[PDB]
Ligand binder design. Sequence first.
Ligand SMILES: Cc1ccccc1-n1c(Cn2nc(C#CCO)c3c(N)ncnc32)nc2cccc(C)c2c1=O
Length: 815
Amino acid sequence: VKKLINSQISLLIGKGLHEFDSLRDPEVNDFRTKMRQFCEEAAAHRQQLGWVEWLQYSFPLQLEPNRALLVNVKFEGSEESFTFQVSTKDMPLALMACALRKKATVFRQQPEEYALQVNGRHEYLYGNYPLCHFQYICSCLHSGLTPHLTMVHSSSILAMRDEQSNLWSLEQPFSIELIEGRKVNAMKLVVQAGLFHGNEMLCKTVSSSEVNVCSEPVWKQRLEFDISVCDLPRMARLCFALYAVVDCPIAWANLMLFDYKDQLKTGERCLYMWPSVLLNPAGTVRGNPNTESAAALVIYLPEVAPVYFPALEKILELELYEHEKDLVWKMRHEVQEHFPEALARLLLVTKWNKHEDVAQMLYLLCSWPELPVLSALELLDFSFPDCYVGSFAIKSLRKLTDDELFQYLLQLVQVLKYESYLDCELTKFLLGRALANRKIGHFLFWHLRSEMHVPSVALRFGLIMEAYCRGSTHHMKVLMKQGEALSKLKALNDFVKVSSQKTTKPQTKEMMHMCMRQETYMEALSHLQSPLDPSTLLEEVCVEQCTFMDSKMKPLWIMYSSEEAGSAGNVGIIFKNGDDLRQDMLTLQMIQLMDVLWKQEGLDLRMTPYGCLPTGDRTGLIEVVLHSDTIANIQLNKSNMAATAAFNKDALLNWLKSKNPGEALDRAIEEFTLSCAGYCVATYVLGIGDRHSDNIMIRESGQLFHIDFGHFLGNFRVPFILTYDFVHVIQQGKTNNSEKFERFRGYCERAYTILRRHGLLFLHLFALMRAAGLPELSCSKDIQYLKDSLALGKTEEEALKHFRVKFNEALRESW
Ligand SMILES: Cc1ccccc1-n1c(Cn2nc(C#CCO)c3c(N)ncnc32)nc2cccc(C)c2c1=O
């Protein structure tokens, strides 16, 4: 049976476990077995959680950042249901009290023994919270809909839990022998080596001598570095570049001078090199897995005697101008005593190529108080390679709530790429958090699963997903069920592209359905948790309603229903294969983040944060927003329709009218204006260009939102943007309506200002994303786009002035 589990894992993680053994690699082995131990202890913990604690683990609450309402409630056993009137202000327990008072009266006759499930969802209502704090209850009020809940008894919840069971002495200047290579070019070759700690070099980059273009080159020479061997910090990173010239890059390669046992490396080494777009400190520190084809650099770390980096207790024993640096360093204790939040800045002035200073720094670091989360996110930047700093940052990060953790999960995952060794605090942290919360577990998995086609991370990511699994057998099954669905989706989509290239849409659509109607597909595509959101159940796929966009990548449109979930189980997923969804996902997360920040100062711009989730190689899902359509479509202004207008500019408004009769119209225009402001500021701050009426959509509520991102931070300076046809809708259909127009400027103005206040949060976040290799996010010039857009260097009186110019500027540009 342990064989079954094993093969399921390899199947799930897209890498077979045998590959881990084949490497006969102590680091991997250690990682594997420690991390297995760790996770199995988590899982053990879990299997004995109390039932309310299990609910917390498995269906964590979904909260928002007096008045009446109809709620429909019923119990698990029977179909009989009651529709109560309760306040929006009542705790779930009041509602439960009612249910039971009604059950008792009908059924002829203990609220604390219950949780309320949202029907047809993995979602629950419990805790000491008024109902309109629950996103679902909240969502329902906004759309008019009657919450539909089931009284689920403690014995039943427990029944679920049960089913889910499983030194200083060495002062000579550091040096290497470059022996030779085995590679491909056109011209002479050179090797450049430099020793890095983070971005900053520990001295100059002693190159090679020029040698002929050749294929199996030989060097046999000492390169000696301008730094004492007893200096080298724990995280010293030796970096090579191989190029050709009469400048033209071929390959690059990095390694730690110390290994994971804190032993300085000796002697020889063959470095399987990575292809080029000269020096790449950021790049991974483990070799190219394609050993057949890769250029190989053989080098010689010499035996300076074994040599270990000193224990902590031995250590404990022992932008700004030149002088300013000197002063911080001097005032470092006082910096610790009175400004504990300036650590980053002090850390960037400590002399990392002088061991004594790194001792003095560390000793302060070791007594340093914990920092706020925002500061910790900054310390995770690659500028802080030291693991004592890493350890510090994780320790400060422990106070992250699950919602926040979820919020920055994509970034923390990306930062694993910076990591120097497989076993590290960040891995332990995330795994601990993922094992403690099934939603984090879900998304960690997919963040990882989705990058397995990527050589430099395949091993690392593979090993974590393995760990996770050892820690959650049941969740593993739930995830294979997702994997099988995505596998069928890929097959289905390939059929679609081949076929559509030979036949009319109607025909391929017919063909797609037959394919889908195969037992093997109905089985695969049904009865699963959405990878976009584990608390959304994809029950039966509605073949009749599925189709595909007959352009470009031919993405698929997959609809699903649920009897038990009714309306709210009528949900859809888009499956796209062929494009990178990373850019899209990132963009959508940042907007979602804007929305959370705005709501936290009580400003709700009625945003539409739909899931977008990469799952594999140029493959992921996008969550369908129903009841929506593009501006472009609407603006096609077709005859024999409700919106049929005398003037094109009326199209969009007629559409809204037709979707929103009588008194409803006002609120629609209101939703439109609110979301409009939101999206306007978000695209503007983010530098999202090439908006046009094809990539904007409105929902029937009037809510406006954006699709197909792929160009941000100004990677065409993006002006703020006002479309006349929106300005026309904001104005209630009037040529001049400056009451309504200026309320709009107001909203834009509030949302702009709130974002500036968390400017640092975006910066630190994007800082972390640089780890991802997204081509529109490659260097400073990009993070600078954000500084400029949030005019972060200015005062709030100023920036607002600045913004006002831009906004008026956009107004002129509107017709
Ligand atoms: C539904 C629709 C109306 C107007 C114009 C285009 C669409 N649309 C869209 C427009 N669209 N784009 C979306 C997106 C995205 C990420 O950039 C999207 C969404 N999340 N929810 C609803 N609609 C969305 N996407 C499709 C994807 C696959 C298959 C199909 C048939 C479509 C599709 O028809």
